[PDB]
């Protein structure tokens, strides 16, 4: 069985990205805990503080596969790495967020009790003047927030709204996603047709479930500013989410949707037009420029899904 052991040595002794991501099929799959837990787990313990990105690409999945093992050393690994990454979540470590997500998710038994240290360390990292961590770190909250509903918001949501634009915005998004997990489903149901700007564009389906509307009003005002090339799917997503006064906003951005076809945003307005139905008269009016685009693959796919929709 030297194949596994040699490739395991060449994980951290690592074209190279392709090879190591091929080796990733062996870690966590074969179940060779004699080397996976004996050596590779210790290697991640010892090297993830300074692991090169070329191997951290493998680590971005191997960390989760190791965390879900459930052994004693695995529990020690999850605790140590979560606490370390939270402390070091800092203007160069743009993998620790993935580390936290991989470690925490699908082990709620450690991280519905441990939501407090996530907040405390994240909102020490988040205040970096670089602002790259200000965006990355808050999104790492989901690793424990999503689990809190699986096994707070309430009080730590009051910390979110005002206690922490950037920080409060990001944490509000990461909390209103869990206030209605169904939005995730809706995203897929709708997707099959600066981080703050995407956060504004992600809030509205999730804000509609929380206080159905001033939050949606401010978010929409920012959506206009996300010139007018934002991913306006956020409004279309409200046609399947809680329809919390979304028709207040249609008179504005429909003119953005109407006035972006034929090309001349295009690939996005293709989906935004279809998301409105899940409003058929406006889509009928909109179909004319869509057919005027010409037989691109995106047009064909969205027209097929439109035919099934309308």
Curated annotation (Swiss-Prot):
It comes from the Eukaryota. This is Serine/threonine-protein kinase mTOR. Autophosphorylates when part of mTORC1 or mTORC2. Phosphorylation in the kinase domain modulates the interactions of MTOR with RPTOR and AKT1S1/PRAS40 and leads to increased intrinsic mTORC1 kinase activity. Belongs to the PI3/PI4-kinase family. Expressed in numerous tissues, with highest levels in testis. HEAT repeats lie at residues 1-32, 33-70, 71-107, 108-148, 213-243, 244-278, 279-310. It comes from Homo sapiens (Human). Part of the mechanistic target of rapamycin complex 1 (mTORC1) which contains MTOR, MLST8 and RPTOR. The mTORC1 complex is a 1 Md obligate dimer of two stoichiometric heterotetramers with overall dimensions of 290 A x 210 A x 135 A. It has a rhomboid shape and a central cavity, the dimeric interfaces are formed by interlocking interactions between the two MTOR and the two RPTOR subunits. Serine/threonine protein kinase which is a central regulator of cellular metabolism, growth and survival in response to hormones, growth factors, nutrients, energy and stress signals. MTOR directly or indirectly regulates the phosphorylation of at least 800 proteins. Functions as part of 2 structurally and functionally distinct signaling complexes mTORC1 and mTORC2 (mTOR complex 1 and 2). The kinase domain (PI3K/PI4K) is intrinsically active but has a highly restricted catalytic center. The FAT domain forms three discontinuous subdomains of alpha-helical TPR repeats plus a single subdomain of HEAT repeats. The four domains pack sequentially to form a C-shaped a-solenoid that clamps onto the kinase domain. It is found in: Lysosome membrane; Endoplasmic reticulum membrane; Golgi apparatus membrane; Cell membrane. It is linked to Smith-Kingsmore syndrome: An autosomal dominant syndrome characterized by intellectual disability, macrocephaly, seizures, umbilical hernia, and facial dysmorphic features. Focal cortical dysplasia 2: A form of focal cortical dysplasia, a malformation of cortical development that results in medically refractory epilepsy in the pediatric population and in adults. FCORD2 is a severe form, with onset usually in childhood, characterized by disrupted cortical lamination and specific cytological abnormalities. It is classified in 2 subtypes: type IIA characterized by dysmorphic neurons and lack of balloon cells; type IIB with dysmorphic neurons and balloon cells.
